[PDB]
probable conserved lipoprotein lppa (Mycobacterium tuberculosis), 338 residues
Amino acid sequence: PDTSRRLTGEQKIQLIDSMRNKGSYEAARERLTATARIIADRVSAAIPGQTWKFDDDPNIQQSDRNGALCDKLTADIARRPIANSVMFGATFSAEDFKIAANIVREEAAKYGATTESSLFNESAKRDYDVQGNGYEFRLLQIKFATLNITGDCFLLQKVLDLPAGQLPP
Amino acid sequence: PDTSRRLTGEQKIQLIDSMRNKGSYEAARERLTATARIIADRVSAAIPGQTWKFDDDPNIQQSDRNGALCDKLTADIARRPIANSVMFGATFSAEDFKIAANIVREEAAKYGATTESSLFNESAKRDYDVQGNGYEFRLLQIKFATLNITGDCFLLQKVLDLPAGQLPP
């Protein structure tokens, strides 16, 4: 290997070690699911007759459980948590949607997610997405309304159990 | 960007900065060409009637001048120097080849290149290659004999002139 290859190898280890302080993907997924509950509860309490549940579909559950890929680490090392998907009982009107979106905004900001967008906002479809700090919170309604959250990248607890300064096998 | 992407971006800068201490590709290429001269001179002095020159072909000269790619950095940032190619006047017998190869070995070791190999060694073709520490020294003879040397990866002087801790544009 030349020097650039040797150093990049050292840097794989350093990258992992620098992420140890963040805690595990497993803890993050738990906490993000709690945050989804908080948002859904506040949304339901702000909006007359709105209800919610965690999606009970067994393959949605497995998919959320598995998480999403990190940008620069493989799935055996680190993953981005996906909070258990939230399904709302009723669709939102335009006014109620703005209320719910404000609640999502308030909670997302606590995670450093403050960059806002909407692919559309009408009877046909309503979308509110806010990202930042590697998090993404999305309230999307086409035929029915959902809340989803994906977190930043976290090392799996099995990597955290590896001594620091070592390449994971 | 997620955390892995943010950190990998930081690490590009760190990689470059950690290579500053090595000096420039331009200096390394000069020094490696001097080493090729040293080897060629010692070879010619050990072997009766052997002569050498730097290859005078203008496109060989340009190719050597341009160098080789580093493993993990682009050619606008760092390159591996290639010493001006050496062409020997006469071909080597088997005995003279072992003598010349021993001289290459002695000089290569000063650069940390000590891992030896030969793709063949006969009237038809004689090859002696020694590598290590990102260097490669090769004495190859098919129809005529050459000496080539490629060095480890070095930052271009233009990158060394950039203040440390900054991404090259």
User: Anything to note?
Assistant: Chain B touches chain A through 24 residues (CB under 8 Å).
